[PDB]
Design a protein around this ligand. Structure first.
Ligand SMILES: Nc1ncnc2c1ncn2[C@@H]1O[C@H](COP(=O)(O)OP(=O)(O)OP(=O)(O)O)[C@@H](O)[C@H]1O
Ligand SMILES: Nc1ncnc2c1ncn2[C@@H]1O[C@H](COP(=O)(O)OP(=O)(O)OP(=O)(O)O)[C@@H](O)[C@H]1O
Ligand SMILES: [Mg+2]
Ligand SMILES: [Mg+2]
Lengths: 715, 17, 715, 17
């Protein structure tokens, strides 16, 4: 059939692009976001086992093989996925389509489709050919749709403004056409017959027409900018709302940069919907009117303009692609130089200590030369295009004028009519030129519409569960785990049958070592992630049936890295909650000993937090999360690693606070390095993976296990 | 089949980017 | 007299701007970089004590006062510095110049000079008027120079290219002027007399002239882009080299963002030197030629064009300032929205746990509305300017055409001459319009030259210290600290008077607590910072008499946050000292046990890392650090905290290797961990910034004091 | 003088930005 390659929206994903291209070749189109979710792409990069598992899921009978140097066997199916090394820096998955004696068809997802020599491919391709076939369950079905017909829906409530803009454009065109015959009337009647006292009147009349064109232009500009802002704001706001609604997998898979980057491309979509839709209509109509007038006025002078337009279109279409192929390389070379500069100035300690002053200077000089060369290539392309367009335009103008003079000589047209023709050409060349150069805008808008329109199609967090809570209004109960299994994306499982039982109102501590999954127990206990195998029970009830908002309202969760957002202490400390009395904050800050800095700050509680704890320290920022947690009235408190306190009295006061609870609540404490482990109701030691040592106070040490040896090692 | 099939850990060691 | 206000380049330096403004008012100009160095600004912000110290240094009799609400007294001098609060978010030093009954003249360094009402001002400024007077040691003098005549020096070696560009532009102008009479010749001779067989010849002749203008345009474009790239590269490279030469105070005072930002403004300087100097000459000459031609052709039609130029210039000059005043606010409102978005998407754990999905949505909607309003204000300004310019241009065109017709009616001018005048106006209006709109470019270039050109005027690290090689050929020597005092800036002295001696000890161990300044001691030993009082002696010789290169290459250092460059292990490991044989790297790896993870890597030693070695964990990162340190084979080693992982066998091997050296080289180990220093010979305990106990561990335990309690607390 | 003079620490607590 036909070779198809799909581009990559993000630098992180390559296997998803290859798998989507292969599926499209076999006749199945899916949104790249779904493909990424199936493969479990991480921020570091795509794993080939993700590709093999996604292929199995889609119905492709697939297998990964480490092939030798020889690529001449005939009995194996194509296309297939193999990895390559980008000039021996990093890996990059690509799909090969057909092999020849010395030509290999290599569809690079990063850049189009290319042909490689056998030796160069064998050097770049380390191994790992992923052979794929349809397994008779593969059904030729495509879930892909049109995003633009969905984003253009936002133009429906604003039909009045669009229609008014169109009417204003039509009247602007009419006045501009009418005012262009001033030179014809001047050089055909007013000067030849020297009809004075009419020149003043006609001049005033044509002045009035121009003081009316500017009003229409002003009004149209006001309306169009208002429309553009109104639609751009709505696009941005819908995207932000849906992102805020997305589950945690979306935030773990993608970085912050990509999510914020899908926020600046709403302007590109707006340009197509607002600018590139109105301009099509108005320029098409105005070009048609101008062309008809030009043809009626003289056909021979019209053919010359038509030829000029054709030449300009041919030149622009030819020069379109080399410009992008040169603009991408400049971006790559600037991205390298900026990283080099930041890396160098960040590590001045090491550079100065080791004496590498000349080496970094030479390296930066070379990178600057490379980016200069790429910019010069783009400059040469622009100069070539501009020179060709200038030659075409100037020769067209001279030819039109000469042919007009030749027509006038034979008594076919009048000189004033020639000047009117020259004036009218501005209303036929400009509209068509706009549509000729509009194609790159439409293409980039279509590209950017598939980067935001695929995110909106992911299943939002709340929907995938059934909610029913008429029977129970409380979280109080026991925590049970039944062979709960969790797996970060597609990697080695962490949580594995963590049989647990937490009676109500028990002091619980989970100790372990770095690497062992211990906060993951809390994360599943708070319904952030979902266990694929097994389930957890509260009060003998499944967490999946529990409503979404209640399971995150009655459970308080401190984080290892506490987050402090820009604002005042009051609003930050009462995040999420609203309509509270000022005494609750006072007592909450008294439990966590916040007053020790409350009097220190210039304002009691309205002190602003600069950017994020810029004037604060870690040992102080730590003392805010507990206050908020206790403020939320937690029926289940999950106190995470509260390190860097550096205050014994604060520890023994805060510890007492937990013991002295007015309302019975299941406290779950995450501890590390055997810190503040004196006495608890239940103590569980996660040495690695599987839970092994689950013993109470003066019961764990007895096991003579690792807890024992560590406990008599500490003291 | 072309060569020798791979195990899950051999797929683990192979990554992209 | 003159109310001078200095505009800050960076957001952090406010006190420096205020002090420079006051000094300029009394008649003394300094480079803002030097004022900033004298006042000692931290990245967090300026200090008032720094301002009082700088005023004392410059000779100003100065004092800070906590003024009350009442400020109606006459008996205190102005101008004076007070701090205000920017809508109750953050502090901002500003200078007041004159007070009235209800008007206060407040020269905000951030934005021009403003007038405040008494109530609003008294609400805005907290306290601390800083009063300054000349102290009779104050000598007037202007130290500033025109850095532009210094950056234009780069144009001197490239005089041939500039002259060739100028000659090409002159010939381009000549051909353009000559080719503009085609319409005059057409409508005055060739059509009136119907002289056929001459129309073809003249058309071909004017076609040849236009196919020669494009060649000159092409050649000029090539030369000008080559010149621009060549000068921009030189500016960038000089700045980068000098930054790499600057001492560590410059890097501690400034952030990474500012240093990299002074790298993108070389383009602005190049635009003035390369573009805005050639354009001045060529456009002035071509405008003079066009104006003379128009005046000779007809004076009456020339006056109308001159009036149009005057109107356009007036409109542009009037509208220049409000456009900048509106563009700055848009940048501020985007900088707020971007920070809000990044902060929100970064802390999704807390937002989802607390259920604040609606609060953040509302806040972002409000910020989006604010930025839309600011953009609409800028849009209204642009539309107003464009409408006024369009009215002026259109009315000028109509009036010129009508006056030309009126002149033709009374037998004063010919119609072809009128068309020639209309064609020629394009060679007079365009050059003058270019010079009219060139003023903002010159102004921003001048601003950008004061922010890159002041950095180049700082004294680099190498020039200060004097040295003689005859004294001590070697570097390794007994270390003696004599009364060393040091503070990072104008803050609490980190180091008080201390006395140390290292008499060729096998091991030296410096232990203390966080914030004591243990690493700062070694940082001062390596001559990164200089001691205020006292000195350090090696072989009874001051470090200030030793060459920088020898003292910098013979001292091996390990940082807390080890830095790994983006390159292969081979080049990363031996940076600074190239031409190193494989045996040295292999034995350094053997001593550091670097081989253990090397076998797992796909390539033994040429493996290319990712950005800063993200995939590599910190455990092997430290091992790379010790390998890099020991590669130099130095005289003195300063080994910082190498805790790494609980794999104690690696630390045991490292200690065994160091003991197996059995050499006369000295080792200074900085470690907070108490157990690892059990086997050390000389142990210095630095508490509260002063050395307290000195000697071996066994006698330190029997000395009671304070070491005893921690030693028997750990074990 | 205008009002009450300040010590070094009172200047220290005052910062800018
Ligand atoms: N995105 C991720 N963030 C954190 N850990 C992850 C992630 N993906 C996989 N993991 C794995 O999950 C485990 C983290 O365990 P967990 O965070 O529960 O333990 P912890 O001891 O509290 O953590 P820490 O490593 O901060 O001490 C590790 O094995 C880690 O490799
Ligand atoms: N730019 C700066 N760099 C380092 N320290 C600074 C700086 N400005 C102020 N300080 C302060 O100076 C003191 C020096 O601390 P330093 O980091 O040298 O401590 P240390 O005892 O060597 O150990 P640690 O690395 O654990 O902090 C600290 O109180 C620190 O807050
Ligand atoms: Mg953890
Ligand atoms: Mg330190």
């Amino acid at each position: 059939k036909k070779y198809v390659c799909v581009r990559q929206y993000d630098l992180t994903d390559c296997g998803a692009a290859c798998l989507s291209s292969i599926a499209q070749y076999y006749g199945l189109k899916m949104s790249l976001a779904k493909i990424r979710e199936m493969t479990g792409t991480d921020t570091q990069g795509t794993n080939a086992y993700g590709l093999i598992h996604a292929a199995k899921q889609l119905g492709f009978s697939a297998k990964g093989v480490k092939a030798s140097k020889e690529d001449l066997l005939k009995d194996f199916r194509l296309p297939a996925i193999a990895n390559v090394i980008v000039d021996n820096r990093l890996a990059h998955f690509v799909v090969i389509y057909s092999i020849k004696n010395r030509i290999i068809t290599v569809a690079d997802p990063g850049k189009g489709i290319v042909r490689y020599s056998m030796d160069d491919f064998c050097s770049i391709w380390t191994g790992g050919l992923v052979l794929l076939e349809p397994g008779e369950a593969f059904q030729k079905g495509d879930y892909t749709q049109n995003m633009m017909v969905k984003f253009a829906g936002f133009l429906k409530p604003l039909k009045k403004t669009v229609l008014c803009i169109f009417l204003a454009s039509l009247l602007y065109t009419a006045l501009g056409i009418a005012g262009s015959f001033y030179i014809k009337f001047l050089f055909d009647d007013l000067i030849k017959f020297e009809k004075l006292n009419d020149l003043h009147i006609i001049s005033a009349g044509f002045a009035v027409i121009f003081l009316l064109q500017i009003f229409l232009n002003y009004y149209r500009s006001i309306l169009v900018t208002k429309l553009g802002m109104s639609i751009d704001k709505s696009i941005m706001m819908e995207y932000y709302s849906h992102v805020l609604k997305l589950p945690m997998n979306f935030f773990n898979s993608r970085k912050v940069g990509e999510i914020i980057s899908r926020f600046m491309d709403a302007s590109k979509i707006r340009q197509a919907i607002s600018g590139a839709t109105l301009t099509i209509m108005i320029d098409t109509i105005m070009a048609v009117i101008g062309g008809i007038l030009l043809y009626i006025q003289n056909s021979s002078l019209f053919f010359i303009s038509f030829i000029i337009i054709l030449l300009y279109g041919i030149i622009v279409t030819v020069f379109n692609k080399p410009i992008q192929n040169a603009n991408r390389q400049i971006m790559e070379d600037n991205a390298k130089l900026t990283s080099a500069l930041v890396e160098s100035v960040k590590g001045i300690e090491t550079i100065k200590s080791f004496g590498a002053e000349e080496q970094t200077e030479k390296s930066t000089r070379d990178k600057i030369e490379t980016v200069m060369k790429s910019s010069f290539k783009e400059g040469m392309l622009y100069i070539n295009l501009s020179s060709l367009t200038g030659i075409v335009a100037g020769l067209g103008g001279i030819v039109i004028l000469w042919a007009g003079a030749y027509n006038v000589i034979k008594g076919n047209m009048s000189g004033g009519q020639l000047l009117a023709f020259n004036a009218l050409l501005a209303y036929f060349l400009t509209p068509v030129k706009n549509l000729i150069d509009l194609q790159p805008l439409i293409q980039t808008a279509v590209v950017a519409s598939n980067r935001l329109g695929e995110i909106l199609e992911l299943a939002t967090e709340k929907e995938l569960r059934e909610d029913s809570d008429d029977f129970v209004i409380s979280l109080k109960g026991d925590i049970e785990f039944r062979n709960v299994d969790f797996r970060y994306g597609l990697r080695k499982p962490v949580l594995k049958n963590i049989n647990l039982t937490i009676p109500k109102g028990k002091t619980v501590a989970i100790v372990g070592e770095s690497g062992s999954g211990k906060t993951t127990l809390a994360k599943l206990l708070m319904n952030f992630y979902s266990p694929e195998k097994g389930d957890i029970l509260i009060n003998g009830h499944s967490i999946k049936n529990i409503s979404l908002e209640l399971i995150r309202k009655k459970i308080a969760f401190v984080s290892q890295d506490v987050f402090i957002f820009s604002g005042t202490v009051k609003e930050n400390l009462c995040l999420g909650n609203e309509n509270v009395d000022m005494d609750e904050i006072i007592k909450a800050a008294k439990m966590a000993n916040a007053h020790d800095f409350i009097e220190k700050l210039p304002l009691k509680y309205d002190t602003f937090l600069n950017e994020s704890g810029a004037n604060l320290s870690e040992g102080q920022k730590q003392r805010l999360a507990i206050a908020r947690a206790l403020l939320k009235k937690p029926d289940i408190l999950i106190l995470d690693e509260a390190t860097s306190n550096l205050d014994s009295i604060t520890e023994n006061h805060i510890k007492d606070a937990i013991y002295g609870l007015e309302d019975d609540v299941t406290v779950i404490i995450i501890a590390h390095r055997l810190s503040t482990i004196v006495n608890c109701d239940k103590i569980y030691l996660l040495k690695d993976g599987e839970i092994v040592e689950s013993g109470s106070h003066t019961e764990l040490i007895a096991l003579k296990g690792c807890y024992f040896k560590m406990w008599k090692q500490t003291e | 089949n072309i060569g020798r099939e791979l195990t899950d850990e051999e797929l683990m060691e192979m990554t992209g980017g």
